[PDB]
Amino acid sequence: SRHQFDLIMCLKQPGVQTGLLCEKCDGKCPICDSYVRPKRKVRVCENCSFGKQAKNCIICNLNVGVNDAFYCWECCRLGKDKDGCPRILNLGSNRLDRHFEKK
Amino acid sequence: MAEKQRQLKLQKIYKQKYIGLGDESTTREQWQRNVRNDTLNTLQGHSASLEYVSLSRGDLSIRDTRIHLLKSMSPGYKAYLREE
Amino acid sequence: LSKGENVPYTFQDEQVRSNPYIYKNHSGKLVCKLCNTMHMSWSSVERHLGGKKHGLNVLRRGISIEKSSGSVGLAIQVNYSSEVKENSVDSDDKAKVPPLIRIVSGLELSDTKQKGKKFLVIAYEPFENIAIELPPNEILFSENNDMDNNNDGVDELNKKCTFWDAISKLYYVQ
Amino acid sequence: KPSLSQLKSQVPYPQIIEWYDCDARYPGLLASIKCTKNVIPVPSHWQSKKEYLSGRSLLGKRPFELPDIIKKTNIEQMRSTLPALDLDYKKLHDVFFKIGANWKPDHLLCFGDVYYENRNLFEETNWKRMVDHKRPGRISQELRAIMNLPEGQLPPWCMKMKDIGLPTGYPDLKIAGLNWDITNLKGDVYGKIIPRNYFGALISFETPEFE
Amino acid sequence: LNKDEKKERTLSMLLLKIKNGNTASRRTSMRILTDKAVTFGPEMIFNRLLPILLDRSLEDQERHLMIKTIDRVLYQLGDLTKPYVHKILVVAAPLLIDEDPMVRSTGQEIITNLSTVAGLKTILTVMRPDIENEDEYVRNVTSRAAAVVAKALGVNQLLPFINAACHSRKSWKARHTGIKIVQQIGILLGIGVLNHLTGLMSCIKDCLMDDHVPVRIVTAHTLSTLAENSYPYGIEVFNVVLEPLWKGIRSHRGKVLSSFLKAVGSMIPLMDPEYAGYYTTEAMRIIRREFDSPDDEMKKTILLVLQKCSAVESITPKFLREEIAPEFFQKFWVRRVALDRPLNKVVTYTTVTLAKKLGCSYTIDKLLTPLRDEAEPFRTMAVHAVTRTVNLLGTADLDERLETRLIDALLIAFQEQTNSDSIIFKGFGAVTVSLDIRMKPFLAPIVSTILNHLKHKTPLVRQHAADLCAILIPVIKNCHEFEMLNKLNIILYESLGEVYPEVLGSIINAMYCITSVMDLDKLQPPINQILPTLTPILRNKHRKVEVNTIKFVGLIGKLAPTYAPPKEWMRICFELLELLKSTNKEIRRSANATFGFIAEAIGPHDVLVALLNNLKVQERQLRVCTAVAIGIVAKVCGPYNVLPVIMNEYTTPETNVQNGVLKAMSFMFEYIGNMSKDYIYFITPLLEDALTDRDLVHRQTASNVITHLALNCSGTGHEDAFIHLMNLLIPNIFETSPHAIMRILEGLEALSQALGPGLFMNYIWAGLFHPAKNVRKAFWRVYNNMYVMYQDAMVPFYPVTPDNNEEYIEELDLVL
Question: CA of C36 to nearest chain D CA: how many angstroms apart?
Answer: 6
String of DSSP letters for E424-483: HHHHHHHHHHHHGGGGGGGHHHHHHHHHHHTT-SSHHHHHHHHHTHHHHHHHHHHHT-HH
**Exposed/middle/buried for residue E184 (C-beta within 10 Å: 0-12, 13-18, 19+):** buried
Distances (CA, A) of C109 to B80, C16, D55, E336, E659: 87, 11, 26, 100, 39
Residue in C closest to E695 by C-alpha: C27
CA D175 – CA D189 distance, rounded (Å): 9
Distances (CA, A) of D35 to C164, D32, E802: 75, 5, 15
CB contacts, 8 Å: E75 with chain B: 5
- Say how many C-beta atoms besides its own lie within 10 A of residue E459's C-beta: 14
The count of structural domains within chain B is: 1
User: Taking Cα atoms as reference points, which of E338, E309, E343, E312 lies closest to residue E325?
Assistant: E309
Asked if A67 contacts A20 with a C-beta cutoff of 8 angstroms, the reply is: yes
- Say how many C-beta atoms besides its own lie within 10 A of residue E538's C-beta: 20
Chain CA centroid to CA E419, Å: 27
Asked if E543 contacts E587 with a C-beta cutoff of 8 angstroms, the reply is: yes
CA A52 – CA A50 distance, rounded (Å): 7
Residues in chain C: 174
- Say how many C-beta atoms besides its own lie within 10 A of residue C152's C-beta: 8
Interface contact D61, partner E, CB < 8 A: yes
Helix E423-435 / helix E469-479 crossing angle, nearest 10 deg? 10
User: Taking Cα atoms as reference points, which of A92, A91, A85, A90 lies closest to residue A10?
Assistant: A85
CA E704 – CA E739 distance, rounded (Å): 11
Asked if E633 contacts E604 with a C-beta cutoff of 8 angstroms, the reply is: yes
Q: What is the dihedral of CA E143, E146, E147, E151, to 10 degrees?
A: 180
- Name the experiment that determined this structure: cryo-EM
Distances (CA, A) of D71 to D83, D100, D129, E364, E682: 18, 12, 20, 74, 12
What residues contact E521, with CB distance under 8 A and at least 6 apart?
A: none
CA E92 – CA E110 distance, rounded (Å): 7
Chain CA centroid to CA E244, Å: 42
Phi, psi dihedrals of residue E130, rounded to the nearest 5°: -80, -35
Q: What is the dihedral of CA C54, C58, C64, C68, to 10 degrees?
A: 160
**Greatest CA separation for chain E:** 94
Burial D141-153 (b: 16+ CB within 10 A, else e): eeeeeeeebeeee
The sign one gets for the Cα dihedral E769, E771, E773, E775 is negative
User: Taking Cα atoms as reference points, which of E243, E248, E278 lies closest to residue E261?
Assistant: E248
Asked if E731 contacts E689 with a C-beta cutoff of 8 angstroms, the reply is: no
CA E145 – CA E180 distance, rounded (Å): 11
Interface contact A8, partner B, CB < 8 A: yes
**Exposed/middle/buried for residue E114 (C-beta within 10 Å: 0-12, 13-18, 19+):** buried
CA B54 – CA B44 distance, rounded (Å): 10
CA E657 – CA E655 distance, rounded (Å): 5
SS (H, E, C) D183-196: HHCECCECEEECCC
Residues in chain B: 84
Asked if E443 contacts E488 with a C-beta cutoff of 8 angstroms, the reply is: no
* E strands present in chain D: 173-175, 191-193
What residues contact C69, with CB distance under 8 A and at least 6 apart?
A: C104, C105, C107, C108
CA A47 – CA A11 distance, rounded (Å): 11
Asked if E18 contacts E61 with a C-beta cutoff of 8 angstroms, the reply is: no
The count of structural domains within chain A is: 1
E809 and B32 in contact by Cβ < 8 A? Answer: no
CA E427 – CA E383 distance, rounded (Å): 7
Phi, psi dihedrals of residue C24, rounded to the nearest 5°: -130, 130
What residues contact A72, with CB distance under 8 A and at least 6 apart?
A: A29, A31, A32, A34, A36, A37, A38, A39
User: Taking Cα atoms as reference points, which of C124, C79, C126 lies closest to residue C98?
Assistant: C124
Asked if E298 contacts E341 with a C-beta cutoff of 8 angstroms, the reply is: no
Using left for φ > 0, alpha for ψ between -120 and 50, and beta otherwise, residue C92 falls in left
Distances (CA, A) of E643 to E227, E681, E686: 63, 13, 11
Residue at E722: amino acid letter: F
Closest CB from A5, A84, A93 relative to B6: A5
String of DSSP letters for E69-123: HHHHHHHHH----HHHHHHHHHHHGGGGG-SSHHHHHHHHHHHHHHHHHSHHHHH
Chain CA centroid to CA D56, Å: 23
**Greatest CA separation for chain D:** 73
SS (H, E, C) E342-358: HHHHHHHHHHHHHHHHC
CA C126 – CA C122 distance, rounded (Å): 12
Residue C173: in which H helix or E strand, if any? strand C170-173
Phi, psi dihedrals of residue E534, rounded to the nearest 5°: -85, -35
Asked if E19 contacts E66 with a C-beta cutoff of 8 angstroms, the reply is: yes
CA D207 – CA E671 distance, rounded (Å): 24
- Say how many C-beta atoms besides its own lie within 10 A of residue E814's C-beta: 12
Residue A14 inside a domain? The answer is yes
The 8 Å CB, 24+ separation contacts for E310-313 are E310/E353, E310/E354, E310/E356, E310/E357, E310/E358, E311/E269, E311/E353, E312/E268, E312/E269, E312/E273, E312/E276, E312/E277, E312/E280, E313/E273, E313/E276, E313/E277
CA E241 – CA B84 distance, rounded (Å): 59
Give D 75-114 residues with CB within 8 A of chain E. 75-76, 79, 81-85, 87, 89, 92-93, 95-97, 100, 103-105, 108-111, 113-114
Identify the bridge partners of residue C164 per DSSP, sorted by sequence position.
C171
**Which strands, in side-by-side order, build the sheet including C162-165?**
C76-79, C170-173, C162-165
CA E317 – CA E309 distance, rounded (Å): 11
Identify the bridge partners of residue C123 per DSSP, sorted by sequence position.
C100
Q: Give me the domain span that covers residue A40.
A: 1-98
Residue at A54: amino acid letter: A
For chain C, the residues before each gap (C–N > 2.5 Å) are 14, 69
Q: Choosing among B26, B28, B29, which should be mutated to test the D contact, i.e. which has the most D CBs within 10 A? A: B28
Q: Are strands D191-193 and D173-175 parallel, antiparallel or unpaired?
A: antiparallel
Asked if E69 contacts E49 with a C-beta cutoff of 8 angstroms, the reply is: yes
CA angle E258, E389, E298 (to 5 degrees): 10
Interface contact E768, partner B, CB < 8 A: yes
CA E361 – CA E371 distance, rounded (Å): 15
Q: Choosing among A82, A83, A88, which should be mutated to test the B contact, i.e. which has the most B CBs within 10 A? A: A83
Burial E124-141 (b: 16+ CB within 10 A, else e): bebbeebbebeeeebbeb
CA E580 – CA E246 distance, rounded (Å): 66
String of DSSP letters for E549-598: HHHHHHHHHHH-TTSS-HHHHHHHHHHHHTGGG-S-HHHHHHHHHHHHHH
**Exposed/middle/buried for residue E274 (C-beta within 10 Å: 0-12, 13-18, 19+):** exposed
CA C116 – CA D190 distance, rounded (Å): 35
Residue at E31: amino acid letter: R
What residues contact E50, with CB distance under 8 A and at least 6 apart?
A: E70, E84, E87, E88, E91
**Exposed/middle/buried for residue E283 (C-beta within 10 Å: 0-12, 13-18, 19+):** buried
Residue in E closest to D67 by C-alpha: E682
Residue A103 inside a domain? The answer is no
Residue at E15: amino acid letter: L
Residue A73 inside a domain? The answer is yes
CA E749 – CA B12 distance, rounded (Å): 20
Residue E246: in which H helix or E strand, if any? helix E239-249
E730 and D43 in contact by Cβ < 8 A? Answer: yes
Asked if E550 contacts E576 with a C-beta cutoff of 8 angstroms, the reply is: yes
Q: Give me the domain span that covers residue B34.
A: 1-84
CA E93 – CA E142 distance, rounded (Å): 7
User: Taking Cα atoms as reference points, which of A50, D10, B25 lies closest to residue E188?
Assistant: A50
CB contacts, 8 Å: E190 with chain A: 47, 50-51, 53
Residue A24 inside a domain? The answer is yes
CA E560 – CA E568 distance, rounded (Å): 13
Q: Where are the alpha helices (DSSP H) in E375-422?
A: 376-393, 400-415
Per DSSP, the three-state class of E228 is helix
HSE value, Cβ hemisphere, 13 Å, CA-based, for E649 = 26
Residue A40: in which H helix or E strand, if any? strand A38-41
Identify the bridge partners of residue C134 per DSSP, sorted by sequence position.
C118
CA E428 – CA E410 distance, rounded (Å): 7
Per DSSP, the three-state class of B57 is helix
User: Taking Cα atoms as reference points, which of A38, A35, A88 lies closest to residue A63?
Assistant: A88
CA E297 – CA E291 distance, rounded (Å): 12
Residue in A closest to E753 by C-alpha: A78
